[PDB]
Design a protein around this ligand. Structure first.
Ligand SMILES: *[C@@H]1O[C@H](CO)[C@@H](O[C@@H]2O[C@H](CO)[C@@H](O[C@@H]3O[C@H](CO[C@@H]4O[C@H](CO)[C@@H](O)[C@H](O)[C@@H]4O)[C@@H](O)[C@H](O[C@@H]4O[C@H](CO)[C@@H](O)[C@H](O)[C@@H]4O)[C@@H]3O)[C@H](O)[C@H]2NC(C)=O)[C@H](O)[C@H]1NC(C)=O
Ligand SMILES: CCCCCCCCCCCCCCCCCC(=O)OC[C@H](COP(=O)([O-])OCC[N+](C)(C)C)OC(=O)CCCCCCCCCCCCCCCCC
Ligand SMILES: CCCCCCCCCCCCCCCCCC(=O)OC[C@H](COP(=O)([O-])OCC[N+](C)(C)C)OC(=O)CCCCCCCCCCCCCCCCC
Ligand SMILES: *[C@@H]1O[C@H](CO)[C@@H](O[C@@H]2O[C@H](CO)[C@@H](O)[C@H](O)[C@H]2NC(C)=O)[C@H](O)[C@H]1NC(C)=O
Ligand SMILES: *[C@@H]1O[C@H](CO)[C@@H](O[C@@H]2O[C@H](CO)[C@@H](O)[C@H](O)[C@H]2NC(C)=O)[C@H](O)[C@H]1NC(C)=O
Ligand SMILES: *[C@@H]1O[C@H](CO)[C@@H](O[C@@H]2O[C@H](CO)[C@@H](O)[C@H](O)[C@H]2NC(C)=O)[C@H](O)[C@H]1NC(C)=O
Ligand SMILES: *[C@@H]1O[C@H](CO)[C@@H](O[C@@H]2O[C@H](CO)[C@@H](O)[C@H](O)[C@H]2NC(C)=O)[C@H](O)[C@H]1NC(C)=O
Ligand SMILES: *[C@@H]1O[C@H](CO)[C@@H](O[C@@H]2O[C@H](CO)[C@@H](O)[C@H](O)[C@H]2NC(C)=O)[C@H](O)[C@H]1NC(C)=O
Ligand SMILES: CC(C)CCC[C@@H](C)[C@H]1CC[C@H]2[C@@H]3CC=C4C[C@@H](O)CC[C@]4(C)[C@H]3CC[C@]12C
Ligand SMILES: CC(C)CCC[C@@H](C)[C@H]1CC[C@H]2[C@@H]3CC=C4C[C@@H](O)CC[C@]4(C)[C@H]3CC[C@]12C
Ligand SMILES: CC(C)CCC[C@@H](C)[C@H]1CC[C@H]2[C@@H]3CC=C4C[C@@H](O)CC[C@]4(C)[C@H]3CC[C@]12C
Ligand SMILES: CC(=O)N[C@@H]1[C@@H](O)[C@H](O)[C@@H](CO)O[C@H]1O
Ligand SMILES: *[C@@H]1O[C@H](CO)[C@@H](O)[C@H](O)[C@H]1NC(C)=O
Ligand SMILES: *[C@@H]1O[C@H](CO)[C@@H](O)[C@H](O)[C@H]1NC(C)=O
Ligand SMILES: *[C@@H]1O[C@H](CO)[C@@H](O)[C@H](O)[C@H]1NC(C)=O
Ligand SMILES: *[C@@H]1O[C@H](CO)[C@@H](O)[C@H](O)[C@H]1NC(C)=O
Ligand SMILES: *[C@@H]1O[C@H](CO)[C@@H](O)[C@H](O)[C@H]1NC(C)=O
Lengths: 667, 243, 95, 211
């Protein structure tokens, strides 16, 4: 309409606070239906909170913060007085807070690890070390008003300009009643817990036509591959041995689709991909006495979705690698910072009370130190006290078998990450920065010092996996190059629409590469951006090319060579031939398969469960925001009074002229 | 919100609902005259929009002042086509009065001609007010008012008071128009179309409410006085009607 | 006629025993000016009772239904799973 | 004269129910007699009552809606197929026509629903005339942006063709199709005010102009 453009300015670059659900609690935010409307008041000091909490003439406000004031204490002050705050727009600060910020809890993944009151009770609720020392738990609270993140500076300037135009107070008096306001729309369809929401979504999908589904389980696919190919249609022999290298693949933040995850997620699976392509280029790979499984777990933030699904499928015979076949386990945690060239080796102390398990873990650590003695830029250390294990994917495997596992990390005590699970864990947190006179095609091939730092960790990991797989002769050829590391860092942290990501994905998957960086949240969308990019990156870094046409590549069964049970086949795009648009497509013959990652409390249908991570996301509709002016209630009562008066006066005058129309209008 | 909606609706459709409820809705013959008047006004608006469509797609939408000139010319030719099809509806009612009376009815007068003038004017008024204000009234149900880009916050109320004046002006213009067409007086026939052109031109000063709303009600009061004395009323008839 | 008036009124009153109070409401609305205004019929004796006991019967459905609706609208979130299995539509955000 | 308003009032109320459903619900955006009336007085009342309760987000239990729908479909069956009040007789025929016209709005494509209507008028009151009058106005209040000018110009166009059809049988005095005059003025005036008058209104409304 041409009149609504005179009334409303929409807000475009935003990010909402979304309700998620647990077995017992709810988190996130919610508005009312048809939005929450509030008068804008900016906050830049502590006197501006008294205007909203006590001194406001127009009580339902909607405040505007810089995100350096988005603190636990100010949230307690806004939550204790809820009838005067309806809405909250948080603006992103480009000089990131120097004290750090982490909205996750003080001890992440608490009741879903090994340590409980029955196994490790001196280490149970992380009594020794608080791992996330800067965590203030704010992302697991429940708010009654919306909280949106403003990502553009120009929209913040427009809102502040409308505040300066209309909402000020002259000479210590009231603001003049035409005032600027803002309306936030985030209405969540879900309720008290995931048991109530899954029940309400199953009743409406059974006893009701036009089914009202009001939740969705958090789910994605894990991505795994083998060094030497396995059969994948049966199970392995009981006397086969694999070496598992695992890493999480996701992150989150306070706000919904924002999840940069550079230090906590991105650098770790980038260096596992580099170690995989370093291990695959060994000349003695086919005649190894053992095998290596690279696995990338997704869902690890929300109480180990993918790792628990992998262990559950592994102990029900539904996965080709059995839990007896797991010989050694090398978990790869946060390795991005490494403040003094040190890479700490975390082990589990309670399972080492068995004497043979302790001998196997000591042999594993001796193997790691022997393979890391050839890299002078990595100083492998172990913690001085018998401290517990950090929250990692090994803790799901240690609830079943007591495998000989190690966790590599950059920290001994608490995290070196000042922005764990936050909006500030971007490429500048791990110092991935490029010079300004380079084209973005040349920024793809520029080597950061972070890339040279992570390629050394990838080299140590690759030579360690080569020694655990019984290689022992061509141990010097295994070395990751920083070229692949800096291309993966530029692809996952800066620009997903590369010239290299396009030449490795399929034609159908080219819309999964946006203009900016990838966000690493485990969405309801059952394959994510990141799962496809990691799968096809692993397919190019581990697979080879074969001469097949596309009709032979979609169906390799009639080929006399090129077995289908052992490998997997994909018809990918190619690089560009010059001066035209010639994608040159080809087959990749790799082992990068996918496995489902949906937590086993959703397959067993026990939605009030205390051991398989019942996390769901609310469904919604119509996330939008807008600013406008409001009129006084004096003017609304005046226009309603004038309308009633015109109507009643018109009825009286019309009936008094109609009744005397025989006399008034003579002929 | 609801207060602005139910206030601006009762200003725009305050007189028109009163006239339709008290005068028109009783007789089952006047509703047909009402819907036929609304139909001929729709045909007038369609034939007026054809000419503006052709002009705006011939002139290629290049210059900004020429589009404003074509806007003024389209408003002028729309006013002229409304006043032509009012004469068309007068000719159709005069042709349909000789057939309804004294040839299909014994008594020669089922409805007079002044009543058909009144109902034709009210029909033009109601359909023009519906196409004037009903899209504006849908935006009054929102929380916001006009003025985020430096406009006036009295947009809705002034649109209601302009719509009500347009309805009353059509209701008066119908009576004065048909009595001018009866007695073969053509100087008043120019004054009706000149007052229509004048009240359509005064909405070109429209963001300045001090001179685009008060002369329109001045014309409305003068045209109501002329439709009163035109239909037969006088002070002799007013002051001897209070028994 | 009037013989097929009472003989159609009794077929309205004997049909409201099949959980039909609105049939009793249209029995009250339609046969009211023919049972309390003009004494003219011999069969006016039983047209005055079939519209009186059917207004007792209709008011009986008002006391039950407006109590049950308020009891459901209050005690629905207090009831647990059972409040969801006998709810036709459940509102979205509120529990 | 009186018998024309006796055909204006039922066709006005049938369009008010449909237009207030399209603009508010946002979801539509004796063997052959009784059996096909049990499928409309019970199976379509169960959907129409249930879909309008979802719009306002209110809780309703099964024992009240099963009491409400049964008090609508059984009185509707005993007033049509058996004797009843005349005011309640015609009111149910308004209500079953609007329900039968709302299923002709949802389950049709955009440019395909004009095919059916077109062919019907081309080869053409009774219950069939109340439906396809209501389909035309409900389709006009759905396609496009917010435009109340196009909905209310198709309302006047149907009432003129309904006026001229009754006037046309004043000389002929024979059963007429009634449809191909009102739908012809509906096919013209919808495609003539949705894209030809609608730009002329918006330029006048942007500068706040009044003709
Ligand atoms: C589903 O997801 C939700 C969202 O996180 C989970 O909810 C959280 O569950 C935690 C369970 O451990 C809750 O932590 C407990 O909170 C208790 C209440 O403490 C109050 O909170 C303030 C905060 O500073 C405290 O100072 C006060 O003491 C208050 O009482 C604590 O009592 C408890 O801490 C105990 O400390 C003693 C000290 O000796 C220990 O012996 C004891 O073992 C325990 O550690 C603990 O901190 C957490 O508050 C809660 N979050 C919210 C927002 O409610 C659900 O548990 C999840 N459901 C599942 C997984 O099934
Ligand atoms: C105010 C004066 C201007 C408006 C009215 C103009 C005259 C209307 C008309 O046709 O009157 C003659 C008509 C007809 O008068 P008549 O019936 O004497 O005409 C002559 C008939 N023969 C020849 C058979 C004797 O008057 C009526 O009775 C019809 C209209 C009645 C209601 C008019 C209400 C007008 C209210 C306008 C102001 C509303 C403010 C809010
Ligand atoms: C005859 C003239 C009828 C004019 C009706 C004007 C209604 C209006 O302005 O607001 C409708 C309003 C608002 O219409 P709207 O076009 O603003 O709605 C769409 C716009 N958004 C999505 C932003 C809300 O409609 C409603 O609120 C829905 C319920 C009522 C629907 C109409 C009932 C009457 C239908 C005609 C009979
Ligand atoms: C959000 O994006 C919309 C585009 O859909 C912007 O609206 C446009 O704003 C410019 C500048 O005021 C106008 O010239 C256009 O006419 C607007 N287009 C519309 C209303 O469809 C809007 O300004 C953006 N919001 C912010 C805060 O930048
Ligand atoms: C993993 O190792 C621990 C420690 O060796 C095992 O825990 C022991 O269990 C036995 C019998 O179940 C008991 O002696 C004690 O409960 C534990 N001994 C300790 C803690 O010293 C545990 O059973 C092993 N297996 C699994 C699947 O966890
Ligand atoms: C992840 O993949 C989805 C699916 O292709 C991307 O969503 C598309 O994004 C483009 C660019 O904004 C839009 O034009 C499309 O309409 C979107 N499609 C869908 C189905 O949503 C998404 O951008 C990708 N994420 C990132 C970070 O690149
Ligand atoms: C990803 O990059 C490609 C090019 O590398 C973009 O494709 C171009 O898109 C523009 C805009 O639609 C077209 O005009 C060009 O013809 C495209 N092809 C080229 C330059 O070869 C693509 O749009 C980008 N994707 C996203 C989501 O930004
Ligand atoms: C992985 O993708 C890269 C994309 O550049 C491939 O590199 C090019 O491959 C072609 C052969 O198809 C060579 O002619 C080019 O010289 C390569 N460019 C380089 C190395 O910069 C690479 O071959 C792909 N991996 C595999 C195994 O095919
Ligand atoms: C464009 C508009 C504002 C012009 C208004 C002109 C007015 C003031 C003029 C022009 C027409 C005039 C009328 C013409 C004829 C008659 C009939 C006569 O028996 C009494 C005077 C009376 C009723 C005149 C009064 C004054 C009058 C109404
Ligand atoms: C808006 C900007 C771009 C241009 C403003 C131009 C103004 C000053 C011009 C353009 C159109 C003009 C109007 C055009 C027609 C009429 C009708 C006539 O009977 C009286 C003068 C009047 C009412 C004019 C007044 C002056 C006017 C409003
Ligand atoms: C802010 C000051 C200094 C300058 C602007 C003054 C504006 C807002 C004032 C001055 C004149 C006023 C108008 C004067 C007369 C009328 C006619 C009445 O029926 C409705 C209100 C209306 C249309 C007023 C609306 C508000 C108005 C336009
Ligand atoms: C080139 C480079 O290393 N960039 C920065 C560096 O300036 C900074 O000292 C480091 C912190 O250790 O983060 C990174
Ligand atoms: C913000 O506005 C400035 C000034 O118009 C512009 O240069 C800049 O590109 C804008 N930022 C974005 C992200 O569009
Ligand atoms: C395992 O490999 C053999 C090859 O000898 C193949 O025939 C068989 O289909 C595979 N899968 C099983 C046994 O599930
Ligand atoms: C120690 O581990 C070995 C191998 O896993 C197992 O055979 C042995 O039973 C364990 N010791 C005890 C006491 O269970
Ligand atoms: C490399 O070492 C292995 C022992 O694992 C041995 O079997 C093999 O013969 C050696 N190869 C060469 C070329 O020395
Ligand atoms: C590879 O395939 C192409 C065509 O598919 C064929 O011409 C070529 O001979 C093949 N090469 C080998 C070594 O089989």
């Amino acid at each position: 309409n041409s009149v609504e453009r005179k009334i409303y300015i929409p807000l475009n670059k935003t990010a909402p606070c979304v309700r998620l659900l647990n077995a017992t609690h709810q988190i996130g935010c919610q508005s009312s239906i048809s939005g929450d409307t509030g008068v804008i008041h900016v906050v830049e000091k502590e006197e501006d909170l008294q205007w909203v909490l006590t001194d406001g003439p127009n009580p339902p406000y909607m405040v505007l913060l810089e995100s350096k004031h988005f603190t636990r204490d100010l949230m307690e002050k806004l939550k204790g007085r809820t009838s005067r705050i309806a809405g909250l727009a948080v603006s992103l600060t480009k000089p990131s807070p120097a004290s750090g910020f982490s909205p996750s809890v003080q001890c992440p993944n608490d009741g879903f690890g090994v340590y409980s009151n029955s196994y490790g009770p001196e280490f149970a609720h992380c009594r020794e070390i608080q791992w996330n020392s800067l965590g203030n738990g704010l992302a697991y609270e429940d708010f009654s008003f919306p909280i949106f993140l403003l990502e553009d500076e120009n929209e913040t300037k427009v809102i502040k300009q409308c505040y300066q135009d209309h909402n000020l107070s002259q000479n210590g008096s009231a603001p003049t009643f035409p005032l600027c306001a803002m309306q936030l729309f985030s209405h969540m369809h879900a309720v008290i817990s995931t048991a109530t929401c899954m029940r309400r979504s199953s009743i409406q999908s059974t006893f009701s036509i036009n089914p009202e589904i009001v939740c969705d389980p958090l789910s994605d696919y894990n991505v795994w591959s083998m060094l030497k190919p396995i059969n994948t249609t049966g199970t392995l022999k009981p006397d086969d041995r694999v070496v598992v290298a695992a890493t999480r693949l996701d992150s989150r933040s306070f706000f919904w689709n924002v999840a940069p995850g550079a230090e906590s997620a991105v650098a770790s699976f980038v260096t596992q991909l580099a170690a995989a392509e370093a291990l695959q280029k060994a000349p003695d790979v086919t005649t190894l006495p053992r095998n290596v499984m690279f696995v990338f777990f997704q869902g690890e933030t929300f109480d180990y979705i993918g790792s628990s699904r992998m262990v559950y499928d592994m102990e029900k015979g539904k996965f080709p690698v059995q839990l007896e076949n797991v010989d050694s386990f090398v978990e790869l945690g946060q390795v991005a910072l490494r403040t003094s060239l040190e890479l700490w080796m975390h082990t589990d102390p309670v399972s080492q009370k068995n004497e043979s398990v302790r001998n196997q873990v000591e042999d594993l650590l001796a193997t790691l130190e022997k393979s890391g003695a050839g890299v002078p830029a990595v100083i492998l250390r172990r913690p001085n006290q018998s401290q517990p294990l950090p929250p990692s994917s090994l803790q799901r495997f240690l609830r079943a078998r007591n495998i000989s596992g190690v966790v590599l990390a950059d920290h001994s005590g608490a995290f070196h990450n000042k922005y764990y699970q936050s909006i500030y864990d971007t490429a500048e947190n791990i110092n991935v920065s490029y010079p300004e006179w380079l084209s973005p095609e040349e920024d793809l091939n520029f080597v950061t010092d972070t890339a040279k730092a992570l390629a050394d960790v990838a080299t140590v990991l690759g030579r360690a996996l080569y020694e655990l797989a019984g290689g022992t002769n061509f141990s010097d050829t295994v070395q990751a190059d920083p070229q692949t590391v800096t291309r993966l860092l530029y692809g996952f942290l800066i620009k997903a629409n590369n010239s290299w990501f396009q030449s490795i994905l399929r034609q159908d998957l080219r819309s999964y590469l946006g203009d900016g960086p990838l966000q690493h949240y485990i969405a309801v969308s059952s394959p994510t951006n990141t799962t496809y990019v990691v799968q096809y990156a692993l397919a190019n870094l581990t697979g080879t090319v074969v001469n097949l046409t596309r009709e032979q590549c979609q169906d390799p069964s009639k080929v006399p060579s090129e077995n289908k049970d052992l490998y997997e086949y994909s018809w990918v795009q190619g690089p560009l031939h010059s001066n035209e648009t010639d994608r040159l497509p080809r087959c990749v013959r790799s082992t990068a398969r996918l496995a489902r990652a949906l937590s086993p409390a959703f397959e067993l249908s026990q939605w009030s469960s205390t051991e398989y991570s019942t996390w769901t996301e609310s469904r919604w509709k119509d996330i939008r925001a807008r600013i406008f002016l409001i009129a006084s209630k004096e003017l609304e009562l005046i226009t309603l009074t004038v309308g009633f008066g015109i109507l009643i006066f018109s009825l009286i005058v019309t009936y008094c002229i109609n009744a005397k129309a025989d006399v008034l209008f003579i002929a | 919100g609801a207060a602005v909606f139910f206030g601006c609706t009762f200003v725009a459709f305050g007189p028109a609902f009163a006239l339709f409820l008290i005068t028109v809705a009783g007789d089952p013959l006047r509703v047909i005259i009402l819907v036929a008047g609304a139909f001929f006004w729709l045909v007038s608006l369609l034939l007026a929009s054809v000419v503006w469509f052709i002009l705006v797609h011939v002139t290629d939408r290049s210059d900004a002042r020429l589009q404003y000139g074509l806007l003024i010319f389209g408003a002028a030719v729309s006013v002229l086509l409304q006043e032509v099809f009012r004469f068309a509806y007068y000719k159709l009612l005069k042709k349909a009065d000789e057939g309804l009376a004294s040839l299909s009815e014994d008594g020669r007068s089922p409805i007079s001609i002044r009543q058909m003038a009144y109902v034709s004017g009210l029909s033009f008024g109601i359909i023009s007010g519906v196409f004037s204000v009903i899209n504006i009234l849908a935006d009054a149900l929102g929380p916001g008012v006009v003025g985020i880009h430096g406009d006036s916050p009295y947009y809705f109320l002034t649109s209601a008071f302009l719509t009500a004046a347009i309805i009353l002006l059509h209701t008066f213009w119908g009576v004065v128009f048909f009595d001018a067409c009866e007695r073969r007086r053509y100087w008043a026939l120019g004054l009706v179309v000149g007052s229509h052109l004048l009240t359509s031109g005064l909405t070109f000063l429209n963001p300045w409410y001090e001179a685009s709303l008060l002369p329109i009600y001045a014309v409305t009061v003068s045209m109501g006085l002329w439709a009163f004395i035109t239909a037969g009323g006088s002070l002799r008839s007013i002051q001897r009607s209070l028994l | 006629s009037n013989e097929e008036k009472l003989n159609l009124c009794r077929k309205y009153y004997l049909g409201g025993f099949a959980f039909l109070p609105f049939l009793w409401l249209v029995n009250i609305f339609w046969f009211f000016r023919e049972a309390f205004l003009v004494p003219a019929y011999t069969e006016q004796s039983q047209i005055k009772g079939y519209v009186w006991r059917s207004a007792v019967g209709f008011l009986f459905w008002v006391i039950v239904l407006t109590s049950w609706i308020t009891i459901f609208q209050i005690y629905r979130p207090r009831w647990g799973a059972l409040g969801d299995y006998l709810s036709f539509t459940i509102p979205l955000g509120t529990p | 004269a009186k018998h024309v308003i006796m055909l204006f009032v039922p066709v006005t109320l049938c369009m008010i129910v449909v237009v207030a459903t399209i603009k508010s619900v946002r979801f539509y955006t004796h063997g052959w007699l009784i059996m096909s009336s049990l499928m409309l007085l019970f199976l379509f009342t169960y959907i129409y009552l249930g879909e309008v309760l979802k719009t306002y987000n209110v809780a309703m239990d099964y024992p009240t809606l099963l009491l409400t729908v049964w008090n609508f479909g059984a009185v509707g069956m005993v007033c049509i197929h058996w004797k009843g009040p005349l005011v309640l007789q015609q009111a149910y025929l308004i209500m079953i026509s609007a329900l039968m016209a709302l299923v002709f709005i949802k389950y049709l494509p955009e440019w395909s629903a004009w095919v059916i209507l077109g062919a019907i008028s081309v080869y053409d009151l009774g219950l069939g005339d109340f439906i396809f009058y209501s389909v035309l106005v409900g389709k006009a209040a759905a396609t496009g942006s917010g435009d109340w000018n196009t909905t209310l110009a198709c309302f006047v166009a149907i009432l003129i063709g309904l006026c001229l059809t009754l006037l046309l049988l004043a000389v002929f005095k024979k059963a007429l199709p009634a449809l191909p005059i009102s739908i012809t003025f509906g096919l013209i005036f919808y495609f003539s005010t949705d894209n030809l008058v609608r730009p002329f209104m918006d330029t006048l409304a942007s500068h706040q102009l009044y003709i």
